[model samples]
Target: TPAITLENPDIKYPLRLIDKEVVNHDTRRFRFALPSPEHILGLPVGQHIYLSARIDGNLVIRPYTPVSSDDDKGFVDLVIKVYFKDTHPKFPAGGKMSQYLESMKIGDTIEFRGPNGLLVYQGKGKFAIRPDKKSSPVIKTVKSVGMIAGGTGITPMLQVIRAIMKDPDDHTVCHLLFANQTEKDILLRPELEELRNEHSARFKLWYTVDRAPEAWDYSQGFVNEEMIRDHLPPPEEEPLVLMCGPPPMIQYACLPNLERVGHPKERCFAF
Candidate 1:
């Protein structure tokens, strides 16, 4: 018999915070224990889970993708960038769910729900993608995948990339143009680099930053047509472009550049 099952997508399971590690000044790696030592999170690639908690008389919920894959047993890991108060000028209130997560103590339990999303990678370059929540999924198969991720948005892309790379039979290629505020802000850099090194031919990695120091080897400034044309696969290659970032960045930067570079609107998916 199975130890435990995350069988119901609608059910919320209480997961205990087993450990937390500081990845940077504002980022944390949270480990939440599953039902038992032998249990896996059972989350599919390109999907996310919602963490719900009551804070300050309000029920706060946030969606996050786990960095740890289902191959790992017992615990699921989340890499979160805490938006502290007064840190950014745009949003003075900061993030409620992120801050609440920071204050959690060992053994503190939080509600976890769903392996949810509109897209699912079905392996070997096949994807089941939905146009909207009510629509049936459309199947898309491609030889290469082009990814444009900003900041914490890299999680879902990483999940799909890892899944494809782990299988020796999957010949799907991946090209990533990861963007961040600075070089230090790139999360999961070590693991990404390791995969690049191991699968050098199959995985292509590039970086772009808002600000650059002297002798920066990668591109600098927001993603532009030049960057997209140079780093990512062209539209003619029948590649699927995945974008995940701030709403403004997706609206202002990624969409326009992708259009200017002639990538079809139907081929791009933003998370």
Candidate 2:
């Protein structure tokens, strides 16, 4: 049986927190135990899960893509960036779900509901995407994929990338342009690098940061025309452009830049 029964999207599966690893000062990797050792999360690539909880007498729900795939049995791993109180001036309260997750102890259970999303990757470069929640999916197949991710947005991109790279028969090329505030803020760096090293020809990786050290090698700035033009697949390739990031970044930075670079609006998808 599937850990997440897709029949009902509203069903909340309470999973126990078995382990938590501190990846950085503000990032954590939470591993939740599945129903059984033989069970998989049954989450499709390009989809995400929702975590809901009552905070301060109000219900708060957040969407997150898992770092681990369905290939990982018995547990689902989530790499979350906790926004602590008094850290950012924009919101003094910080993230409710993330902070709540940070405070969770081993053996504590939380509600998870999903495989929720409009996109699903069917191997061999095929994708089924719905224009809206109520519509049927449109099938799109291509030979290559271009990805743009910011901060925690990399999880979904990684999910699709790993799925493509794992199947030898799937020869889809993937180019990733990842952006972050600083070098330290980059998550899953080692895993991305390992995938790059293992599948050098199939995957191309590039990075951009807002702040650069004295000897920085990658680009230092918001994602611009040059970065997309140089690092991502060319528009003529008819490659699907996938983007996931903060709303402002996607609106003001990514969309305009991708448009300027001539990527067709119909061929682009934002997560």
Candidate 3:
């Protein structure tokens, strides 16, 4: 029997992996087909989906945030970072679902359901934190957005950025502090560069890598209080700061450090 796959009978309406492209050493971009040519993915920006399969007789489900924009129709695109134990010394074993996904062939199908999560962009820096339930969806205004991310955590922030930038009327400014292990580990660098080049006045990006190539001009070392204070929008700008990354970085470094630098817990959210 195969160790991993979409062979489980319990799965339903499997989405075919029509294409896969290598993003980096441990990352892959996957495009899955919708039901038909007329079909469109109902998923909203800043949301995720549950991909499930029965591996070795047990149902395994995982949540992944898609990198596709809302305007992208007829298919869904997911940029996944596969963890191999050989690379991640902290995780002795590779991720189960990520490994299964990496092993899939072009035509393989897997079960997917949802436009999950509470965060939804309603245009022009407005968001519904938890639109799943409750009374009428409350609208909140956010003039400027500042985000701190490490590695694959940048996807959700990307959703918000794409929504804001693509709209002709949204003049909201975006500030991003992205930290990575190395320059080569940075995801979506080309797209980010394009955005920066086109919207230099409204978009700002600060990159921090543990180490850098000789000519790298960005910051070095961890994201610290000074970095946040200098790069993030001031509290007076009605900026909402978001942090997403590994648990250790989010729990200790980002939250605590940003708080000390003036972006307190009230104005910050971690995903």
Candidate 4:
């Protein structure tokens, strides 16, 4: 049921890079135009797409969840953090697909396929994944949501945040605890702030930087239980706490912190 090619297997859809915005030194927002003016990506909230490009005679495919709101028309936007060898010492080689994507210029085309992933949002409380075939399965309505994001982990959280905050009808409250190495590493700061400013009552945001400058004013160090409990809604609301980031952030920080707060394991999702 993927919408990229709209069931036309014979035609491989090509997404043309229409515009680009520099998110930071390591990240950029790539906006790709759809084949037809009326063609929407039709990507559901909490889903992802497989972006494939041939590099060095091999097919390189990476899954990226667009930061663009699902309702956005004519184009899809992806905030990609390009990994380089300088920053990633262990790999030494760095990320091949990411580097290739970063080097592409505007008007260049990339092949895309699949809206793959198990998590699919269906209104306020209800959702369906691969295993669930029953129609309209009623999950508990999520009145509040808690999130822990590190670096570009903000992508999926941003997707969920925009869908809820943009719609006046969905009254789900959000609490986001975003952690980065420095203030400079934070992605989509402006957009997150704008959403917070617009929906202060229902949305709350906090930041944690490992090495902050003097001007920085927010939580510091790693994401701890204190920051999580204080910023996130009480577990009584049964809020979904999403964990997204590098391995250490998830295994060491997010999961341990969430468990400390007595958050249910069933309600947690790792992006």
Question: Candidates' TM-scores?
Answer: 0.97, 0.97, 0.90, 0.90
Ranking by TM-score: 2, 1, 4, 3
In model 4, which range of ten residues has the least summed lDDT? 1-10
Query: Which whole-number lDDT from 0 to 100 does residue 83 have in model 2?
Result: 94
Ranking by lDDT: 2, 1, 4, 3
Model 1 residue-pair collision total: 0
lDDT of 4: 0.81
Question: How does model 3 score by TM-score?
Answer: 0.90
Query: What is the clash tally of candidate 2?
Result: 0
Candidate 3 off by > 4 Å:
1-13, 131-138
Question: Over 4 Å off in model 4, which ranges?
Answer: 1-12, 129-138
Give per-candidate clash totals.
0, 0, 0, 0
lDDT of 3 by residue, 1-271 (tens): 2122222324455799999998899999999987765566666677777899987677899877888864665678888999886666788778888889999998999988776676777888887775344645456678888899899988888888888888879988899999999999999999888989988777898899989889988888788887888888987776888888889988877887877877766677776
Q: What is the lDDT of residue 230 in candidate 4?
A: 93
lDDT of 1 at 167: 94
Per-residue alpha-carbon lDDT of candidate 2 for residues 1-271, written as tens digits (9 for 90 to 100): 4554334677888999999998878989999998887788878889999999998899999998997888888899998999999988998999899999999999999998888999999999999999999999999999999999999889899999999999999999999999999999888889899999999899999999999878887898899999999999999999999999989889988999999999989999999
- Between candidates 2 and 3, the one scoring higher on TM-score is 2
Q: In candidate 1, where is summed lDDT lowest over 10 consecutive residues?
A: 1-10
lDDT of each: 0.91, 0.91, 0.80, 0.81
Candidate 1 C-alpha lDDT tens digits along 171-270: 9999999999998888888989999999977799999999998889999999889999998898999799999989988999999999999999999999
